[PDB]
C-alpha cells in the first residue's frame, strides 16, 4: 500500500504537525489513544489507511511521523498534551541547546551528532512499508533548525534513498513582516539544498494567510492555532488521493511529472477556497465555477505574490467532495478565456484536475465549517521571482555592512558560504526571466 | 534541559538578587522552605533551570553569593529568603573593597577568586548542560566593579562558549553616590567589552523617574527599584522556563540583538507599568503594551532614545496573545519611526511570545533594545574620567595597591572606541 | 577517451576567445598603498595522473577569471565567468623571482624611509604556503633559501649596509609572537602570556616583549627553528600539522641609542581552518579554538576595507590580532601587502573560490 513519511523539522514544523495529525485522526475515526471506536459499530472497513498509520496487533494505530527540533520545549507540549499516548515515544528531542536562529548551528555544530539518531530512526520506519514512498518534510525558512537541520537532513536522505519523491512544505519569510532580524540570512542559505535535493518545495507565507483570516474568515485576532489549520486543510488535499476513493486520483509521482517543467523551477505556490465563516456558509452558492474562480483574485494566494505580474507554467486543480466532472470543464474554458490569467506559449495544455470525492471535514473548535466541496490549486507561476527579489534585497542590504556574520563563521561555517548562496539565487532568479519570455521567429 | 548559574557580586548585587529569587519563587509557586506548593503542574517542568533539587521535595537556587562581606551577611541570612540559599555558597572574605577597584581586582579579589571558582565548578558539574551565567553586579562600587569583572575574566576563560549576561547597574549623570565613580566605570567597561556576550545598562535615575512619572509612588525605597529590575530579569529567561508559541532562548536574543561583537550594551524596558488600586482606566491589549514599551520615559538606562537610531530591538511578549496583532503593531512602529531606526537593516524588531503571564497580570512584555543612544552613557563618564585623570586626582589609592598609570590609559582608549563605533551608526548614510 | 574531457573542451575554446596579455617580469610599479597578491601554483605531478582540469585562467596583470562546470535549466552545460580584479594577477608560469619583483618588495624601502609596513600570507592546504613563508620551496627539509622569507631577509639586512644607511647606525632586532584565542604569547618562552596595553602616547605595545639583537642573514633564518619548536599549538588532526594560532615575526629598525623605533617589519602566517571543521569530533577543545580563528580572520578582512574605504570608526578591538598590529596600519608613510595562494584543481574549485573572494574586499570593479 502507498504511504508517506511525515518528517516535521523545527518549531514551525512541529507546530504544524500538531494540527496535521489532529485532522487525520478525525477523518479516519482514530481517537487520541490509538483506537478506532467509530468503525467498530459498523464492523468493516480498513479506514485507518496504511498511508499514514502503522497498525499493531492490539488494535492501536501509530503514525508514520518523526520530528526533530533540537529543543525540548516544543515536543514536551506533545509529550504531555492530548496526543501523548498516540505517537511512538521516539519523538527525537535531543538538543542540549536551541539552534539560535542561524544556519551554522545548524548544518554543522549541533545538527551533527544528533543526526545519527535521526537517519537510523527513518530506516527503522521506512522498512515497514511496501510500495510508494514520499517524504512529507515540514519546516520553515528563516529559523535555525528548520533551515539548518533540514539542509543536513536532505543531503543525508538523497543518498540513502536516491530518487524518492520529497514534498517539503516550507514557510517563507514575508516581504513586509519578519519575526527575526537574521531571517534573511537563513532563508538564502537553505536554498542551496532545497534547490538540489528536495524535488518539490511548497512555499506558503504568514502575511498572505493573515489577510485570509481577516477578510474571508472574519477573524480579527488570528493566533498560530488558526493559521496551521489552513495549512492542514491544504496538506490533507495534497495527499488525499493516496487514501480516498476518487474519480481522478493524482499520485505523488503525478505531481513531479506535471508541476515541474525544469529540474530547478519547483516552487508551486498553493491556494485554497476558505470563504467559509460560517455565517457566510449561507448567503452563497459555492458551486464549481465559484470555488474555481477563487484563484483569480490575488487576495487569495497563500504567498504575498501577485500572479498578474507573471506567467503561469502549469497548474493542478485538486478537488474534494461533491464535484461532478462536467462542471469542471465549464470552470476551465472560462479561465482560458480571461486575458489577465496569462500562460506561456510552450504550455498549451495548462491544467490537470484531480477529483477526489471525500468532503473536507471540520475540526471542532472553529473556525470554518462544513462546505460541500473545495480546491487546492498548485501552480508554479513566474511571479514567485519577484517574491525572492524582495528577499535577496534584504540579504544584500546587510551583506555590504558585514552584519551578523561572526555568529555564522564562528560556528564552523566558512564566510565564503554566503556568496555561494548568493550566486545560486542570482542565477535562479535569472532562470525565471528566461522561461517566461517566449521565443520569436 | 538548559540551566543557569546566578552569581551576585557587589552589595548592589545581592540586594537585587534577594528580590530576584523572590520573583522567581512566586513565579514557580515556591515557599521560603523550598517546598513546592504551586497551583498547576505546568511550572515544575523547568524548575531545573534555576532550582536544583534536594533530598525531600525541597529546591535550592544555584545562587553563588560573592558579595556577602559581613555587613550584608546577616541581613541576607536574616531576611525573607535566608533559609533558601545553600550556606556553602556564601563566599566572602574580610576587609571589603572600600569603593576601590584595585582592592577588588588585584589584592582582595586574588585571595578570594580561588574560593569562588571552587564552588562554580561544583555547581557546573551538578548540571546536565549549562548555557547561562547571570552576574548581577553594579559599576561604580568596589566588589561589584573589580571583583565582579575578575570572575568574568576567569569564568569566560574556563567556559569560552557560554552566554554570559551581566545585568550591570551603571552610574548616573546627577545621582552621584560615589566620589570615585568615574574610575570604577572606566576600569570595568574595559572588562565588559571583551568578556561578555550581553550586558544590560541600568541606571538609577530612569528607575527614579518611573516611580515618580509613571508609578506615582510617594516614597520609592530601594526595594521598589529592584522590583522593577527583577521584573526584567525574569523576563529574558521566560521562554526558557515556560512553553510558548514563538520561543526565544538567551541565545536567540543574543544572536539577533547584536550586530558586531562589541556592540552589546542593552537598555531594558518593561510594560505594563501603571499606578492604581483596583479601578484603573485603561484596557490591557496588545496595542496598549506597545506604545508604553517604546515610550522614552519607560527605559531604564537614562538616555534619550530619540537622540539616536535603534540598531535592533527585541519584544519578549508574555501572556495569551494573537500573533497578527503582534506582527502588525511591531510593523507600524517601524514605519512611523523610519529615521529613529537604522535604515540599512531589513526588519529591526524581533518578537518572542511565551504563553504564561505573571501571577497577577493578564499580559506583559519586555523591551530589550540595542541603540546608539547609549553613546550618552559612555560620553558622560569619559568626560568625568578625563577631568579626574588629568590632575591625577585620586590615583594614589589605586597605584598604592599595585596598578600602573598605563592601565588607566588602556581603559579610556577602549571606552572611547565604543563611542566611535556608536557615533558612526547614529549618523545617516 | 577521458571521461571529464567535455567540461575542459569549453575551457580550451575559451582560451582563444579573448586576448592573452599576461604578466612579464620587469614592469613598472605604481604607488598602491594596499596591494593584494594572488599567486597561482603550477600543475603538480599527481594531478595529471588523476585527470585534472586546469580551471584558473590568468588573462591579465590585474584580472583573473575562474570557470566552473554548471548547467542550464535544460541540463545544458556552460561555463560561468567569475570575473575578479586584482592588482597583481599572477600566472602559473611565474617563478619566485618574478614574485621577487612584487614580494621581495619595495615596502622594505618604505621601512628605511621612516615608515612601517606589513605582509600577509593567506591560503589553503596544498596551495603554496609551504613554499613561501613557513618553510620554503626546498624539498624534504623546507629550509629558507628559495622563497620569500629568505629573500626578504636579504632586503632588510643587506640594504641598510649601504653607507647612506650605514651612517645612520641602524641595528636589527627580532621578536616572534603566537596569537591564540585572545592570547598573545611569545615563542621564546611558551608559558609567558603577555598583556596588550597602550601607553599614553598612543602606541600599542605588547607589555614585556623580549627581543634579540641578531644577526646576519644566515642566522636570522635559523631563528624559526626556535620559533617552530613548540609546534604551536597542539595539533590533533589527520594531515599533521596546521597551525591554529598565528605567527607574527616582527623585525624592527632602530638605532643604537634607542629607545626610538621606526621601521617595524612583520610577517603573518594566516593559517586557519582549511579542512572542514571536524564536528564529529566531540572534543570540546576543538570547537573552542576552531571558532576563534575564523572570527579573527573576519577581523582582518573587515579592518583593511575600512582602511581603503576610509572612515572614522576604524574597527580594531574586535579581536587581538588586529589590536597588536594597530600601530603598523595607521602610520602616515605606511603601506600593506597581502598574499593569497591558489590551488589549480577542479576537485578543489570550491575551496579556491572561497580564497579568491576573501581577497576581494577592496571593491575593485571589472572595467574590462
Ligand atoms: C489588583 C492588581 O492587578 O494589582 C496589580 C497592580 O495593581 C499593578 C499596578 C502592579 C503592582 O506592582 C507595583 O506596585 C510594583 C511595586 C514595586 C516594584 C514594581 C511594581 C503590584 O504590586 C504587583 C503585582 O505583580 C504581580 O503579581 C506579578 O506577578 C509580579 N510580581 C512581583 O513583582 C512580586 C511582588 C511581590 C512578591 C512577589 C512577586 C511579577 C512581574 C514580573 C515577573 C515576576 C513577577 C500586580 C500585578 C499588582 C500589584 C499586586 C498591586 C504593577 O507591577 C507589576 C510588577 O505588575 C505596577 O505596574 C504594574 C501594573 C499592575 O496592574
Ligand atoms: N505558521 C506558523 N509559523 C511559525 C510557527 N512557529 C514559528 N513560525 C514561523 O517560523 C519562523 C521562525 O522559525 P521557527 O520554526 O520558530 O525556528 P526554529 O526552526 O525553531 O529554529 P531555531 O529556533 O532558530 O532553532 C518565523 O517566520 C515564524 O513566524 C507556527 O507554529 N506556525
Ligand atoms: N538599585 C540599587 N542600587 C543600589 C543598591 N545598593 C547600592 N546601590 C547603588 O550601587 C552603587 C554603589 O555600589 P554598592 O553596591 O553599594 O558598592 P559595593 O558594595 O562596593 O559594590 C550606587 O550607584 C548605588 O546607588 C540597591 O540595593 N539597589
Ligand atoms: Mg526554535
CSV table of C-alpha atoms and ligand atoms in Angstrom, one decimal, chain A residues 10-12 69-71 74 98-101 143-145, chain B residues 246-248 252, ligand 4:
chain,number,residue,atom,x,y,z
A,10,UNK,CA,11.9,22.9,13.7
A,11,UNK,CA,9.3,24.6,15.8
A,12,UNK,CA,7.3,25.6,12.8
A,69,UNK,CA,13.7,20.2,16.8
A,70,UNK,CA,16.9,20.3,18.9
A,71,UNK,CA,14.9,21.8,21.8
A,74,UNK,CA,8.3,22.3,21.8
A,98,UNK,CA,18.4,25.6,20.7
A,99,UNK,CA,19.9,26.4,17.3
A,100,UNK,CA,19.6,30.2,18.0
A,101,UNK,CA,18.3,31.2,14.5
A,143,UNK,CA,14.7,29.6,11.6
A,144,UNK,CA,17.7,27.7,12.9
A,145,UNK,CA,16.6,24.1,12.8
B,246,UNK,CA,7.5,31.5,19.5
B,247,UNK,CA,10.2,30.7,22.0
B,248,UNK,CA,13.5,32.7,22.5
B,252,UNK,CA,18.3,33.6,20.0
D,4,LIG,MG1,13.2,27.1,17.8
